[PDB]
Amino acid sequence: GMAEQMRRVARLFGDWPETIIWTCLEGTMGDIYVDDSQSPQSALALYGRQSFFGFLAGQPHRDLLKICEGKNIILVPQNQAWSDLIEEVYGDGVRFFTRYATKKDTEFDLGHLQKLVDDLPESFDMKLIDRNLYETCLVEEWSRDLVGNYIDVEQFLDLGLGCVILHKGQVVSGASSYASYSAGIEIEVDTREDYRGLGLAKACAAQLILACLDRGLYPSWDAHTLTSLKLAEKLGYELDKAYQAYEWR
Amino acid sequence: GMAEQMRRVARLFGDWPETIIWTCLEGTMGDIYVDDSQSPQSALALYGRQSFFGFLAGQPHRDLLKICEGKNIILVPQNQAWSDLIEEVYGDGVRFFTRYATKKDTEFDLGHLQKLVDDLPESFDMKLIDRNLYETCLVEEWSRDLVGNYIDVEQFLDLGLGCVILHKGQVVSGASSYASYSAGIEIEVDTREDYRGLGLAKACAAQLILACLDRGLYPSWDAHTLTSLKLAEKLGYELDKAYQAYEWR
Numbered sequence: 001g002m003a004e005q006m007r008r009v010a011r012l013f014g015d016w017p018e019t020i021i022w023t024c025l026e027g028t029m030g031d032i033y034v035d036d037s038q039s040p041q042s043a044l045a046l047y048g049r050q051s052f053f054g055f056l057a058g059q060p061h062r063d064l065l066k067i068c069e070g071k072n073i074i075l076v077p078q079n080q081a082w083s084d085l086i087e088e089v090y091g092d093g094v095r096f097f098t099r100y101a102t103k104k105d106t107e108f109d110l111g112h113l114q115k116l117v118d119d120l121p122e123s124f125d126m127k128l129i130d131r132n133l134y135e136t137c138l139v140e141e142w143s144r145d146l147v148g149n150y151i152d153v154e155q156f157l158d159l160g161l162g163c164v165i166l167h168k169g170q171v172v173s174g175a176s177s178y179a180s181y182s183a184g185i186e187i188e189v190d191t192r193e194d195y196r197g198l199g200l201a202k203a204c205a206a207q208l209i210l211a212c213l214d215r216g217l218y219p220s221w222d223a224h225t226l227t228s229l230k231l232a233e234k235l236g237y238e239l240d241k242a243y244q245a246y247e248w249r
Numbered sequence: 250g251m252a253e254q255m256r257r258v259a260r261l262f263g264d265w266p267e268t269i270i271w272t273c274l275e276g277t278m279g280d281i282y283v284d285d286s287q288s289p290q291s292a293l294a295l296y297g298r299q300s301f302f303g304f305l306a307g308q309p310h311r312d313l314l315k316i317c318e319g320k321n322i323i324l325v326p327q328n329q330a331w332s333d334l335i336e337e338v339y340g341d342g343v344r345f346f347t348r349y350a351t352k353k354d355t356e357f358d359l360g361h362l363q364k365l366v367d368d369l370p371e372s373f374d375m376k377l378i379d380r381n382l383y384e385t386c387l388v389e390e391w392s393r394d395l396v397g398n399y400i401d402v403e404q405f406l407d408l409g410l411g412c413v414i415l416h417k418g419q420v421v422s423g424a425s426s427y428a429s430y431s432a433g434i435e436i437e438v439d440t441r442e443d444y445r446g447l448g449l450a451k452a453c454a455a456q457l458i459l460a461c462l463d464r465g466l467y468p469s470w471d472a473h474t475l476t477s478l479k480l481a482e483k484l485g486y487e488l489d490k491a492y493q494a495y496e497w498r
């Protein structure tokens with residue numbers, strides 16, 4: 001039946017430790033597309049609402065790539081074969097770049113993380129994202145990914161977790177669940193354009209990691225850039241490996 | 250996609266606190282069948298290997314009943330519309346009977362449970378089911394459901410949990426996981442005919458519950474008979490409601 005079919009699909013991804021894939025495969029958020037629901041040899045774990053991720057596994061297949069078209073999406077190939085089809089089909093219509101996966105067995109230095117939180121200057125107020133702050137994070141574009149992948153505020157409060165810094169009554173930095181899975185969250189951090197250079201996103205992240213641990217959740221980091229990897233390293237994460245990714249040109 | 254369709258199917262079952270339905274919808278064990286992949290209005294949560302449950306949700310649909318035919322199965326209708334279809338289609342070919350659901354918010358008296366375990370006479374030996382006892386349970390029809398729903402010993406040891414009472418070197422009673430879900434198990438208790446009426450079921454049930462609680466698992470009880478309900482009440486469970494069930498005659 002349907003459940004057996006999904007078990008087969010999960011095998012196409014195998015041991016691919018990207019928590020967003022786990023989200024899609026677990027069933028509550030994200031979605032899964034295949035070449036043939038009856039005899040699946042190709043799969044896509046598609047996740048997001050404004051920004052997206054498309055993890056492509058199994059046999060390279062053109063139709064799954066078409067699903068990803070027209071979206072503010074990061075395509076992640078399982079292997080060179082997927083990358084080859086992506087380049088073959090879209091050529092200049094796609095932009096190759098490199099992301100950095102971190103190990104999922106992180107040992108965190110709590111004193112260090114609490115220190116980062118504690119060092120925050122006097123006028124900056126750290127808060128957990130609640131019902132009202134959820135909506136606040138949706139107001140400006142810079143902060144939307146902190147909560148925008150959740151269907152509504154209720155799904156965020158139920159399944160998400162985040163924390164924001166306020167300064168003079170405005171949210172100016174945040175760290176929150178870009179996605180959630182059964183045992184953790186995938187972290188997103190953001191700082192407003194006019195509040196750079198103050199270590200705000202590091203402080204938020206420190207706080208979110210502590211809140212995750214306090215709740216027995218694993219806080220996952222997957223870096224979009226080297227600068228992002230450098231910050232993860234300061235938080236206690238270690239690089240797993242650099243990996244191929246693509247975006248539409 | 251596939252995960253969205255599975256979310257739609259799950260809604261058909263709604264708030265139905267039977268853990269085997271949870272097993273089937275979580276994705277690891279059991280399976281799910283529907284009238285229409287794209288427009289699901291009727292669904293079947295089917296679980297088992299030697300004995301089975303068929304939980305039927307949504308609009309009554311005769312094709313889902315057909316999937317249950319020729320199996321050692323308990324059919325559980327979500328509603329009276331399903332019951333009416335079952336009776337109409339099969340007439341004297343189904344036996345109608347009442348099972349008793351228990352509340353899932355049980356407060357167990359650990360002291361009481363341990364006393365029941367302690368009261369097992371020295372003549373009897375209580376043991377957790379291991380690789381060898383797994384095989385012993387499968388050999389007799391009376392004990393096979395203690396472990397038989399798992400694909401093999403490896404799956405049973407990984408996801409299941411159970412214990413047995415031995416006397417003169419033979420397994421004479423046992424309490425084990427008929428099924429498992431993310432946060433618990435569904436209990437199966439059995440006693441060999443010649444050893445009934447000696448309080449053995451109560452002792453192994455008490456031990457299993459204690460084993461569950463110790464591991465943070467919820468030990469669920471769904472009573473096949475009033476006698477089973479009365480046992481559950483001694484163990485701390487409280488009746489939720491009597492409900493309709495069918496078997497093939």
Ligand SMILES: C[As](C)(=O)[O-]
Binds near residue numbers: 438439470473474
């Ligand atoms: C063996 As029973 C606890 O399902 O009546």
Ligand code: NA
Binds near residue numbers: 027274275276
């Ligand atoms: Na699941």
